[PDB]
Design a protein around this ligand. Structure first.
Ligand code: 78M
Ligand code: 78M
Ligand code: 78M
Ligand code: 78M
Ligand code: 78N
Ligand code: 78N
Ligand code: PHE
Length: 429
């Protein structure tokens, strides 16, 4: 009695992440459109460029938060309660958007989700490994099934939430995301008791008595330093929303710069790929709503194409690895990400940017970037959240450059630059 050949505990962790990814991507599939709506009603006083910049820096902070989440669970609270309380905060984040608020609830929702995802995301993957004794062949297979559940929830979420939004408005749609996380917590709590090791109800590497004080000093200096900057920024007048976004961008990018100051192309190639891939929920989401002949279905459903192609490619790629150079899998994967943007430059160049084009352009675009991602994933998970975070931090600046007038050039330059650097890697490798 197994779960696809794996310990039964995988089933609990499978579903738990599926429903968290459901709540997360269901929210993101309509959040940008929700901000557009708040702007159009005059409730939210920002530009569409800023709203899209917020989408990118949001994702950046979510993964940056995931970089330290493992530490807090391993040393302080425990992996199991970290997942639970992380899920609680996430559920609360979606509840906030379900309340009859407008722009006033956005910041609170963002913070709750960032902190919550930071506790849950790295620790649920940690718990997956705990199912396996140290040297097991099943381990690789078990994680792969786990990734499938992640993309499963990411697939059905834009379909369900997006349709719900179209029918019953935004607040109801955000509530379904909250319900999704609630389902995950239910399964996780009761399913976890049956299987999961009681060992991870407590931290596995608890702080030694002499470790507490220097840790306290470290976090206090950082918070004080971060507070000092914000204070200084306000005195000089750099206190607009884009000014804060810039600060977060600088912070997110400074961290790896310093980490290395204390693999470089491999990390850069990862950052650039994730930047392109993460723009599917921002730039491609904008393009879908403005340039696509899609009047017979919710435009938010385009967000399902990314996890759809992942689920479609994985059985094929499972062959390739058994059918027959780690840096080269980054070199080519980045070229495919660049080709996906080059493809998007075509309909605007051929038909102009004023009208509407086929949805098949987006399908082809995602088909290429996911093809790139298939090479990326097989090639320190805290660093995995880091390259992802910087890529999104880069997006927070680049994404603002995108509009109907600049569409063709935007896709062309970043499409070409990505391919070139993929070839630059070919020469270096
Ligand atoms: C919210 C929906 C789930 C039902 C929970 C009911 C109990 C209320 C509060 C319990 C909080 C304690 C946290 C439990 C925990 O660390 O999670 C471990 C899980 O694997 C099983 O214990
Ligand atoms: C290890 C991490 C430490 C690195 C932190 C470095 C931060 C130093 C300075 C950041 C403040 C500048 C960002 C704010 C800003 O310029 O806003 C833009 C403003 O011109 C918009 O009108
Ligand atoms: C690997 C080869 C696959 C085929 C791809 C070749 C096509 C790539 C780019 C061609 C774009 C043509 C679209 C029309 C165009 O650019 O004309 C614009 C300009 O002449 C009019 O103002
Ligand atoms: C691994 C798969 C690679 C994907 C290749 C990229 C696909 C190339 C072109 C896709 C869309 C072509 C247009 C189809 C169409 O029906 O045109 C209608 C018209 O409205 C065009 O805008
Ligand atoms: C590298 C990221 C650090 C961020 C963590 C945020 C938490 C800040 C302070 C929490 C530390 C307090 C925990 C101390 C503790 O419970 O252990 C002391 C006992 O001697 C051991 O059980
Ligand atoms: C085999 C995979 C897909 C192949 C993708 C190849 C596409 C490469 C470039 C496409 C777009 C070329 C640029 C067009 C351009 O800048 O013209 C300007 C427009 O006339 C208006 O700005
Ligand atoms: N699509 C990925 C996003 C991600 C990238 C990198 C690290 C962590 C998460 C997921 O849901 O898991």
């Amino acid at each position: 009695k197994t779960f696809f050949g794996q310990p039964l505990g995988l089933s609990t962790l499978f579903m738990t992440e599926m429903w968290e990814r459901f709540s997360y991507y269901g929210m993101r599939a309509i959040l940008l459109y929700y901000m557009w709506f708040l702007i159009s009603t005059g409730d939210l006083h920002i530009t569409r460029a800023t709203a899209a910049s917020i989408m990118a820096i949001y994702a950046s902070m979510v993964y940056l938060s995931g970089t330290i989440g493992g530490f807090v669970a391993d040393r302080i609270i425990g992996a199991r309660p970290a997942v639970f309380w992380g899920g609680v905060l996430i559920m609360l984040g979606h509840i906030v958007l379900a309340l009859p608020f407008g722009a006033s609830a956005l910041f609170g929702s963002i913070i709750l989700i960032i902190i919550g995802t930071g506790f849950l995301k790295p620790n649920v993957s940690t718990l997956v490994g705990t199912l396996y004794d140290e040297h097991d062949r099943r381990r690789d297979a078990g994680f792969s099934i786990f990734v499938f559940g992640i993309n499963l929830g990411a697939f059905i979420a834009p379909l369900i939430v997006g349709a719900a939004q179209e029918a019953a408005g935004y607040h109801v749609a955000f509530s379904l995301a909250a319900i999704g996380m609630f389902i995950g917590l239910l399964v996780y709590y009761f399913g976890g008791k049956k299987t999961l090791d009681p060992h991870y109800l407590r931290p596995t590497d608890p702080l030694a008595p002499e470790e507490v004080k220097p840790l306290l000093v470290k976090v206090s200096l950082a918070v004080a330093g971060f507070i000092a900057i914000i204070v200084v920024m306000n005195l000089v007048g750099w206190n607009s929303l884009p000014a804060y976004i810039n600060l977060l961008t600088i912070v997110a990018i400074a961290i790896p710069v310093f980490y290395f100051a204390w693999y470089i192309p491999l990390f850069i190639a990862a950052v650039l790929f994730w930047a392109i891939e993460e723009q599917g929920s921002v730039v491609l989401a904008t393009f879908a709503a403005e340039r696509v002949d899609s009047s017979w279905f919710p435009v938010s459903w385009f967000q399902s194409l990314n996890p759809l192609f992942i689920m479609l490619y994985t059985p094929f790629f499972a062959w390739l690895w058994t059918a027959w150079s780690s840096p080269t899998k980054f070199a080519v994967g980045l070229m495919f990400a660049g080709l996906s943007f080059l493809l998007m430059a075509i309909p605007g160049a051929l038909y102009g940017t004023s009208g509407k084009v086929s949805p098949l352009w987006l399908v082809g675009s995602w088909a290429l970037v996911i093809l790139g991602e298939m090479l990326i994933s097989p090639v320190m998970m805290s660093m995995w959240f880091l390259s992802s975070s910087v890529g999104s931090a880069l997006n927070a600046q680049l994404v603002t450059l995108y509009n109907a007038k600049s569409e063709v050039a935007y896709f062309s330059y970043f499409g070409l630059g990505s391919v070139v650097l993929g070839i630059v890697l070919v020469f270096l490798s």
